[PDB]
Nucleic acid binder design. Structure first.
Ligand SMILES: [Mg+2]
Ligand SMILES: [Mg+2]
Lengths: 48, 48, 48
RNA sequence: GACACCUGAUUC
DNA sequence: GAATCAGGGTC
C-alpha cells in the first residue's frame, strides 16, 4: 500500500505505516490515507 | 452507503458525507450525530 | 458493547449501557468511571 | 479491539 | 491543563 500524508510533519507518499505514522501521530488534525497505487497516494497529497 | 444522522446540530437530518455532517456538529454544544449504513436507520436516529 | 464500571457516582456497580452509566456520573462531583472488556475487570475498578 | 487526532458533554 | 465517556485516519 502507499501511504499518503497530505498534512503532517513531513508530507509525501511513504511505503510503510511505520514511516507514515512518524508524520501524523500526535500531530493535530493530520490528514493521511493509504492507497493501492502510487498515483492515488500522490493525487491525495496534491489535493492540498 | 454512508448516512450521517444529525439529531442535534446546526441542521438536523441525514447527510451523505462526513464533511457535510461535520459542518453541522463541529463546535456545536451537545451535538448529537451518528453514522449509519442505511438511510432508514439514519432517519430513526433523527426522528426518535 | 463493554462493561461500564462506576466507582463513584449516584449508584455504583457495573452497567451495560452508556445511558445507565451516564445517569450515574453526569454532573456528579468527583465521579469515577471507566469501560472494561469484562465484568471482572469492571468490578475490579469499582472496588479500588 | 487498539492507536492517533477532531469535536462535544461532564468532572477535577 | 487532565481524566472519563459520547460521535467522527491507521493497526
Ligand atoms: Mg517511505
Ligand atoms: Mg448532504
Amino acid at each position: 500500500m502507499f501511504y499518503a500524508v497530505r498534512r503532517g510533519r513531513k508530507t509525501g507518499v511513504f511505503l510503510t505505516w511505520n514511516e507514515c505514522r512518524a508524520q501524523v501521530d500526535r500531530f493535530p488534525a493530520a490528514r493521511f490515507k493509504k492507497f493501492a497505487t502510487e498515483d492515488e497516494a500522490w493525487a491525495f497529497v496534491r489535493k492540498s
